[PDB]
Scaffold this motif. Structure first.
Motif, PDB file in Angstrom:
ATOM      1  N   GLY A 137      30.649  22.307  34.519  1.00 18.46           N
ATOM      2  CA  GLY A 137      31.523  21.184  34.204  1.00 18.46           C
ATOM      3  C   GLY A 137      32.395  21.558  33.021  1.00 18.46           C
ATOM      4  N   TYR A 138      33.397  20.740  32.722  1.00 18.45           N
ATOM      5  CA  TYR A 138      34.297  21.048  31.625  1.00 18.45           C
ATOM      6  C   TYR A 138      34.945  19.787  31.085  1.00 18.45           C
ATOM      7  CZ  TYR A 138      37.878  20.634  35.309  1.00 18.45           C
ATOM      8  OH  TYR A 138      38.689  20.167  36.324  1.00 18.45           O
ATOM      9  N   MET A 139      35.419  19.905  29.851  1.00 20.22           N
ATOM     10  CA  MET A 139      36.206  18.865  29.206  1.00 20.22           C
ATOM     11  C   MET A 139      37.329  19.548  28.456  1.00 20.22           C
ATOM     12  SD  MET A 139      37.000  15.762  28.279  1.00 20.22           S
ATOM     13  CE  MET A 139      35.612  14.754  28.789  1.00 20.22           C
ATOM     14  N   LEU A 140      38.550  19.054  28.627  1.00 23.29           N
ATOM     15  CA  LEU A 140      39.682  19.640  27.925  1.00 23.29           C
ATOM     16  C   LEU A 140      40.672  18.557  27.562  1.00 23.29           C
ATOM     17  CD1 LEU A 140      42.380  19.821  30.044  1.00 23.29           C
ATOM     18  CD2 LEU A 140      40.924  21.583  31.102  1.00 23.29           C
ATOM     19  N   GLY A 141      41.484  18.840  26.553  1.00 22.78           N
ATOM     20  CA  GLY A 141      42.509  17.897  26.211  1.00 22.78           C
ATOM     21  C   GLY A 141      43.110  18.109  24.845  1.00 22.78           C
ATOM     22  N   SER A 142      44.016  17.200  24.508  1.00 27.49           N
ATOM     23  CA  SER A 142      44.773  17.249  23.262  1.00 27.49           C
ATOM     24  C   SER A 142      44.454  16.043  22.390  1.00 27.49           C
ATOM     25  CB  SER A 142      46.273  17.307  23.558  1.00 27.49           C
ATOM     26  OG  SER A 142      46.678  16.156  24.295  1.00 27.49           O
ATOM     27  N   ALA A 143      44.565  16.236  21.083  1.00 28.84           N
ATOM     28  CA  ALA A 143      44.279  15.194  20.108  1.00 28.84           C
ATOM     29  C   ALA A 143      45.013  15.489  18.811  1.00 28.84           C
ATOM     30  CB  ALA A 143      42.770  15.079  19.861  1.00 28.84           C
TER      31      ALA A 143
END
Lengths: 7, 7, 7, 7, 7, 7, 7, 7
Positions: A1-7
């Protein structure tokens, strides 16, 4: 599984 | 922001 | 499954 | 924002 | 699936 | 804005 | 801005 | 899967 993103 | 998670 | 989007 | 989730 | 757009 | 989502 | 996510 | 865009 994975989690990605911008903040 | 933008996010994507999957599992 | 997945969840994605903008905030 | 925009969102899409699926499972 | 997908989500796209402008904001 | 403009949006399109599909699943 | 513009965004596209898919999974 | 992927997420892309501008901010």
């Amino acid at each position: 599984g994975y989690m990605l993103g911008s903040a």
